[PDB]
Amino acid sequence: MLSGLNHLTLAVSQLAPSVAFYQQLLGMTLHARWDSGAYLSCGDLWLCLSLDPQRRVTPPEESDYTHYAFSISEADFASFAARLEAAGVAVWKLNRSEGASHYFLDPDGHKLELHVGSLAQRLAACREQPYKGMVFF
């Protein structure tokens, strides 16, 4: 039986700018680096950056909705989003829902998100105002 996410690996086109983004801009802990990768952590999350000649810097119009959201508190949300704006980090979507989300791109065009709130909170909001066709189990 599966017990959770073990690690998330992102393919990157250039290691140095990606390590700078995840370690210095986003504040993740760098544990190890080698000629073709790095291991970082963010709380419980193990993140691997893998240098991949097949990775292209992908504009958000050319990739699908697959994305990775990181947890942050409401109190820290606005200042963290302002930090990203100062560094010139691109936004790929406006938040059009209730709840706090900021949608931003990494150097290779991986789609990231800052989100406040848990699955339980989302389910409770959906029970009050369900999506079309929604069934609960």
Which residues here bind its own copies, judged by CB under 8 A? 1-11, 26-28, 30-37, 39, 41-46, 50, 52, 54-56, 62-73, 76, 80, 96, 110, 113-115, 117-119, 122-123, 126, 130-137
Structural tokens at position 5: 């996410």
Is 112 within 8 Å of 67 (Cβ atoms)?
Answer: yes
Supply the minimum distance, in Å, between the C-beta of residue 67 and Mn ion: 6
What does the block give as tokens for 2? 């599966």
- Residue 129's binding partner among ligand VNV, its own copies, Mn ion, none (Cβ under 5 to 8 angstroms by kind) is none
Task: Give the closest residue to 43 by CA, choosing from 5, 78, 3.
Answer: 5
Of 117-136, binders to ligand VNV (CB under 6 A) are 133, 135
Question: What is the C-alpha to C-alpha distance for residues 42 and 68, in angstroms, rounded to an integer?
Answer: 13
The residues of the shown chain that bind ligand VNV, judged by CB under 6 A, are 33, 133, 135
